[PDB]
Amino acid sequence: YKLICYYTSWSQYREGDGSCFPDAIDPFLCTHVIYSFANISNNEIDTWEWNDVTLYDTLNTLKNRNPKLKTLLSVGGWNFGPERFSKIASKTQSRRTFIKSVPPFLRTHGFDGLDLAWLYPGRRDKRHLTALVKEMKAEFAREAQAGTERLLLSAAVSAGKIAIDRGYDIAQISRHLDFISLLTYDFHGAWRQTVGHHSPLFRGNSDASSRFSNADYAVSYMLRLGAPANKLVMGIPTFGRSFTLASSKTDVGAPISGPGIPGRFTKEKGILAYYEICDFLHGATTHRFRDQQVPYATKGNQWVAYDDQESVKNKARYLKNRQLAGAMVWALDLDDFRGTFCGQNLTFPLTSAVKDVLARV
Ligand SMILES: *[C@@H]1O[C@H](CO)[C@@H](O[C@H]2O[C@H](CO)[C@@H](O)[C@H](O)[C@H]2NC(C)=O)[C@H](O)[C@H]1NC(C)=O
């Protein structure tokens, strides 16, 4: 089983303990660590933060304590417009140029592969996404001839039924991708003003409207579309989505007036690092959707939907029973990397909870 762990570039700028550098990562923890967001300029992959080469080096030295460890670099992300990806991939000339620029970059900085985070291809992009994966992989095979190890190629895909039908040809890109990561956590997406859990596991059978929103539906679906189990990796979140209530009501359906107030370290609306959530729980009321097997908490006029050690131990357990390739964890930096925020003395409590279940066969 694989344990893919995303690490983000901008977690270095957080104040106090919130700050995080590749330095704090346990090398023996995950199998694959995906460094977050490279960029594109003049049609070639390129750096993003001023000090990326430095940090590239720090992350890639962990492979010195753990040789089994594999690291990849990711291109795209939410704050990277899709029109941008879309326009590189639809002109074979600008496309072929980006591809050729990739292997040497990865090699110079010591990455074992590249990851595509084209955040949401559209109806008009399905065909080019395919071209890009196909051609990119071809380029990696041809390059392994120089007698060095073949660079890995992966992709982070949407888990929303309508998004998968609209922009992905799952059957095709699964042939060329080393693994596929399922973004199974943005379900109660950005819109609608009702309280709800962003990463529920099941249908929460007490809910009738949207069955397409949950890890289970998403997974079954991808399998039907043709992606093979041994390439699928299920996304697990390490952050919580927050709302500012608009009434005394706190149960399913309750009205929302907007996002939740920012975390003291995370500084961003509607979001909360896990270590922040640990502090938050003090004086907070905790509840747990039995149906979807995921917890939520309220305190004041704030309602937080999140994932704890056991809702996570559970998602992990599902993943195994359906025989998938492994689990993907979004942001080791959003977890309690110091281990001084969530009661117990453990470091990376959530990510290691997943690793425990994954390591028991
Ligand atoms: C990522 O690469 C992009 C595209 O190369 C960089 O984009 C910009 O470059 C110019 C100088 O700032 C601007 O005039 C343009 O707005 C812009 N091109 C676009 C958006 O089409 C961008 O700087 C890079 N991002 C970072 C953080 O370096």
Pocket of ligand 1 contains residue 248 by CB under 6 Å: no
CATH class of the domain whose range is 239-306: alpha beta
Report the amino acid identity of residue 122: G
β-strand pairing of 326-330 with 285-289: unpaired
H or E element in which residue 74 lies: strand 70-76
The burial class, CB within 10 Å (0-12 / 13-18 / 19+), for 78 is exposed
H or E element in which residue 356 lies: helix 349-358
Write the residue with the smallest CA distance to atom 28 of ligand 1. Answer: 48
Contact between 199 and 213 under an 8 Å Cβ cutoff? The reply is: no
Q: Resolution of the experimental model in angstroms, please?
A: 3.1
All CATH 3.20.20.80 domain ranges in the chain, comma separated? 1-238+307-361
Query: Token match 């709302």: residue?
Result: 243
* Cα 40 to ligand 1 centroid, rounded to whole Å: 9
CATH T-level fold of 1-238+307-361: TIM Barrel (3.20.20)
Task: Phi first, then psi: give them for residue 99, nearest 5 degrees.
Answer: -55, -55
What gap in Å lies between CA 79 and CA 321, rounded to an integer? 35
Write the residue with the smallest CA distance to atom 7 of ligand 1. Answer: 41
All CATH 3.10.50.10 domain ranges in the chain, comma separated? 239-306
Pocket of ligand 1 contains residue 47 by CB under 6 Å: no
Write the residue with the smallest CA distance to atom 11 of ligand 1. Answer: 41
CA dihedral (203, 208, 213, 218) in degrees, to 10, reads: 60
Pocket of ligand 1 contains residue 41 by CB under 6 Å: yes
What gap in Å lies between CA 21 and CA 101, rounded to an integer? 27
* Cα 53 to ligand 1 centroid, rounded to whole Å: 19
* 47 Cα nearest atom in ligand 1: 28
* Cα 41 to ligand 1 centroid, rounded to whole Å: 7
β-strand pairing of 256-259 with 239-245: antiparallel
Which residue among 39, 42, 105 is best mutated to probe the pocket of ligand 1, counting the most ligand atoms within 8 A of its Cβ? Answer: 39
